[PDB]
């Protein structure tokens, strides 16, 4: 409602409720938390970045976006989960507190907000971007399929009409031209995470080739040891293993592209659960996914601090 601590953390929310959100957040931490407005999307409306920082200098930085798919409801719960969890542990977590003590922060909460507003509105499992051209009746490009790493190979479609459509060219996509733009301005990202469901997966690249990353081993054993972490707290299990390998080529995808810019602790979530309610994911979740899955997160930013 008027503060983050009387917010209700364990209902699904609104994209106004959500933006309305970031800014008590920021008003009750203004020495922690900024928000920037990256873009705009398709339809207007503000593209909204969430910055932890301590202060600096351009300070090595972590991404994480949620809600890519507007439908993977857990995300944006997750994320909002996430923001004021930031604002919790810092000063309190040791851990946590020398990580944006030297590092700052990036969280996208709404990476696709057209699409999440539609969600609501009309198609509760509507997953693309809502943006049109004349050259077809169908809407919407899948956002995850629209960045420039294998672009267009197999591991998405070429149709617009398609699920998986990977747009006209890559970043057509102002929702994904808007965190390219962001990241390659920064120049200093060192983990990059995006943050989807369902499936309970932890992935790293690659999607788009079979070829094997040259930090493959590295980013293995990262994955084994946050799906270990996650694991802790509920026994919610999770397998992981490079996007191919797992779960078949994905052409176009954000980590895919992260890791070809050099940010090495790039990896993909699939949140709960593994079929049961898919996307929609009960409500009395969102918490025990929120507060697992942080650990998972935790585990990746103190080994990005460390190296
Ligand atoms: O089919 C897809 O779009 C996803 C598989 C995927 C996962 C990570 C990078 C690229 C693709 C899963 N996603 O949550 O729907
Ligand atoms: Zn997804």
């Given amino acids: 409602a ?11 929310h609104t994209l106004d409720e959500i933006y309305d959100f970031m800014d008590l957040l920021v008003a009750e931490h203004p020495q922690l938390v900024s928000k920037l407005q990256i873009g705009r999307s398709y339809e207007g409306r503000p593209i909204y970045v969430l910055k932890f920082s301590t202060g600096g200098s351009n300070r090595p930085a972590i991404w994480i976006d949620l809600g890519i ?3 993977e409801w857990i995300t944006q719960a997750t994320g909002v989960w996430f923001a004021k969890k930031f604002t919790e542990d810092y000063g309190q977590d040791p851990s946590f507190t020398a990580i944006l003590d030297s590092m700052d922060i990036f969280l996208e909460i709404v990476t696709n907000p057209d699409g999440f507003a539609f969600t ?7 997953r693309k971007t809502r943006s049109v051209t004349s050259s077809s009746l169908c809407v919407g490009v899948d956002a995850n399929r629209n960045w420039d790493a294998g672009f267009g190979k197999a591991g998405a479609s070429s149709s617009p009409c398609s699920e998986t459509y990977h747009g006209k060219y890559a970043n057509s996509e102002v929702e994904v031209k808007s965190i390219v733009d962001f990241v390659k301005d920064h120049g200093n990202f060192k983990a990059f995470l995006s943050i989807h469901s369902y499936s309970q997966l932890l992935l790293y690249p690659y999607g788009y080739t079979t070829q094997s990353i040259p930090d493959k081993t590295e980013l293995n054993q990262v994955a084994k040891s946050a799906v270990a972490a996650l694991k802790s707290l509920y026994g919610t299990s999770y397998k992981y293993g490079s996007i191919i390998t797992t779960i078949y080529q994905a052409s176009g995808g954000s980590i ?14 699939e949140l709960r659960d593994t079929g049961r ?15 697992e899955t942080w650990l998972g997160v935790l585990t990746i930013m103190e080994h990005t601090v460390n190296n």
Avoid: V
Wanted: charged share 10%.
């Fill in 120 to 126: 609501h509105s009309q198609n509760r499992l509507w």
């Fill in 277 to 291: 309610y898919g996307f929609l994911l009960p409500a009395s979740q969102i918490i025990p996914t929120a507060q």
């Fill in 256 to 269: 895919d592209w992260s890791y070809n810019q050099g940010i090495k602790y790039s990896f993909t979530f």
């Fill in 2 to 12: 008027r503060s983050t601590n009387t917010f209700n953390y364990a209902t699904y």
């Fill in 69 to 71: 798919h507007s439908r």
